[PDB]
Amino acid sequence: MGKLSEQLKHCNGILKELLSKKHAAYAWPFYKPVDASALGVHDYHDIIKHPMDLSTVKRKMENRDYRDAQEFAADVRLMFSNCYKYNPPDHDVVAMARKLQDVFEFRYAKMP
Ligand SMILES: CC[C@@H](C(=O)OC)[C@@H]1N=C(c2ccc(Cl)cc2)c2ccc(OC)cc2-n2c(C)nnc21
Ligand SMILES: C[C@H](O)COC[C@H](C)O
Ligand SMILES: [Cl-]
């Protein structure tokens, strides 16, 4: 697959951290694709045109889909944006998204 660039190594590090046990209390809703039928949210795919989640980001990293850090970051941010778009701002899952995005943005800012 070829060695990840230095910046994408940092991105992969961030991804591993987001999936790690220390953040699980607020990261878990973002681990896998939203299953709209399972959750009973039958309007989800009318509202969210481009679903994203951490397992999909991980697959894309493993498959070398991301050509740079910017592309990676856009997907992680898309995941958070979908959450902010679908849910009311006072929902528990939105608070969790904000917390995980704080973890993400502060470490992404430490890009070599
Ligand atoms: C799908 C919409 C929303 C919902 O109303 O579910 C019933 C959902 N809430 C939740 C959610 C609701 C309350 C709390 Cl405390 C945590 C997550 C949700 C749950 C599981 C899951 O994957 C297994 C994804 C979730 N998620 C994400 C991401 N963004 N919005 C949600
Ligand atoms: C809570 C906002 O939607 C995202 O905040 C990012 C900041 C680094 O906490
Ligand atoms: Cl972006």
Side-chain angles (χ1 to χ4, degrees), residues 26-74:
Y26 35 95
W28 67 264
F30 305 97
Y31 284 170
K32 290 287 150 66
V34 171
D35 187 338
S37 57
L39 293 177
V41 292
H42 300 297
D43 56 351
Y44 190 81
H45 293 291
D46 299 284
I47 291 164
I48 300 302
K49 305 319 306 159
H50 300 95
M52 186 53 55
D53 71 282
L54 293 173
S55 77
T56 298
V57 176
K58 182 73 170 89
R59 175 189 105 285
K60 287 177 74 168
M61 186 70 68
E62 293 168 350
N63 290 340
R64 302 300 189 258
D65 208 337
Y66 298 119
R67 294 206 59 236
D68 53 31
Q70 289 68 35
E71 191 180 353
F72 162 83

Side-chain angles (χ1 to χ4, degrees), residues 84 98 101-102 105-106:
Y84 307 143
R98 294 196 190 93
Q101 183 156 23
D102 189 84
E105 295 296 343
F106 276 80

